[PDB]
């Protein structure tokens, strides 16, 4: 489709930032929510559930954790929180607060301890969800942030937008339709505006071992402003959670006991 083709062309012409702004602008012509509701999707033995927040990339969703759920079999059951609006018909959230509310609702209405997990921008959604859960009285035992680049610490990702955008078209596992592409615009604006709050929750940073592009020093790595443990897995920003899902599972096991 036209949006998908424009996204591709945005990547090769160095104009992703302004195309993301166009997608955000379009997304303001879909309907939004701020009594809407959603449901987790079950993906096994274990005492503490690993709950996964879908990413916010155009190809994102529950399916992107299939390989880590499999690698976590025998360690923890795995449930997945979808990001509302990536499926046709779903409204978009008016804010980070609006999506954490309905997501927090669905976790509390179906749990029994748990940790919350997310990849890339998914990590930021996961930490917002855990923030909202700790505020409501049902706090997870911790958060696992997989290649998180919080706002203000994304110089590497911005300098690699062409590499990442072409890599997303290689690994297009669900096809980026219009509903997905505008949702990408709308969530990208929300997470850009959002700022994590200190919570005191135990935090595990799972960083990639390999950069997605050239860089002069180590400062390309994920970062987190509050106290946390850090572990590295083989792979780049994309492969760390797919072809190397087992390396992450083992670190999650160790961190859980």
């Amino acid at each position, epitope marked *: 489709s036209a949006l998908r083709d424009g996204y591709r062309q945005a990547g*090769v*012409s160095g104009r992703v930032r302004s195309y993301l702004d166009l997608l955000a602008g379009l997304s303001d012509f879909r309907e939004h929510f701020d009594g809407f509701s959603l449901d987790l999707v079950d993906m096994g033995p274990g005492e503490v559930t690993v709950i996964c927040c879908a990413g916010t990339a155009a190809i994102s969703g529950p399916h992107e954790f299939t390989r880590l759920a499999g690698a976590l079999r025998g360690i923890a059951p795995v449930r997945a929180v979808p990001q509302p609006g990536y499926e046709e018909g779903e409204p978009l959230p008016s804010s980070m607060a609006a999506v954490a509310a309905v997501q927090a609702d669905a976790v509390i209405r179906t749990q029994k301890p748990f940790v919350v997990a997310g990849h890339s921008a998914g990590a930021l959604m996961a930490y917002a969800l855990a923030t909202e859960l700790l505020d409501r009285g049902h706090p997870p035992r911790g958060v696992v942030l997989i290649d998180v680049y919080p706002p203000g610490h994304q*110089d590497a990702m911005n*300098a690699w937008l062409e590499e990442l955008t072409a*890599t997303l078209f290689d690994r297009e596992t669900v096809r980026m339709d219009d509903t997905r592409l505008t949702a990408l615009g709308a969530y990208d604006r929300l997470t850009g505006q959002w700022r994590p709050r200190e919570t005191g929750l135990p935090t595990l940073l799972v960083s990639a071992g390999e950069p997605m*592009g*050239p860089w*002069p020093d180590d400062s390309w790595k994920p970062t987190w402003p509050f106290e946390h443990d850090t572990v590295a897995v083989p792979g780049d920003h994309f492969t760390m959670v797919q072809e190397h899902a087992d390396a992450i599972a083992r670190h999650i096991d160790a961190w859980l006991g």
Partner: antibody
Amino acid sequence: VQLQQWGAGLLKPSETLSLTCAVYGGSFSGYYWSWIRQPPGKGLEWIGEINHSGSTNYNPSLKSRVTISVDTSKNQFSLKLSSVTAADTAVYYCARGLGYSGSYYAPNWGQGTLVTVSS
Amino acid sequence: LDVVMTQSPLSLPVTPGEPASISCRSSQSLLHSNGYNYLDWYLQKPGQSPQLLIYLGSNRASGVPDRFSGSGSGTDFTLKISRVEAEDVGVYYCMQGTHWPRTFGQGTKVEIKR
């Protein structure tokens, strides 16, 4: 979309070179911004670069004397080079994102200010 | 230690409408884990600032006519013009972007044999 360059063209040895580049047409926040120099008759030497947050990459041969600054408020970035000698005589250019991806629509380099060092 | 870029030939006279090729060889590989090569080509026409022609080894900047094209990977790279025209007189530089500092080849001057 366009870069304008100004600054003093003659300075005595041991003094401090000072140049400024202004970026017209936005897109300031997505790229590192470079300074390059070209002594008369010779090739190109990369000096260093800065982004909007003020993060800085320098050429080790010049790191001791070079300072690159940014003023996001005016979309301007500046070059200062201290304790200057005759080997710093050159044409100095400003540019966007040298060597990074994303450069299909790269702006033209600044037109370059010649800087001569002499008493 | 800095990449050293060697350009060949340093001087290249071509009769117009003939093709021409410039080679450059780096002292370390410009190939990156992710597959891309970070090699740029610039043209400095007489009296002007360098301008980008080829970026990421093989991609043409906007406004660059299709007679220009680049090729190569890892340690050697070439720039080729198919039908050399009068407008193409100037000095061609390659520059590597995989390492810091960025470093340039010596430059090769193209003269039109008229």
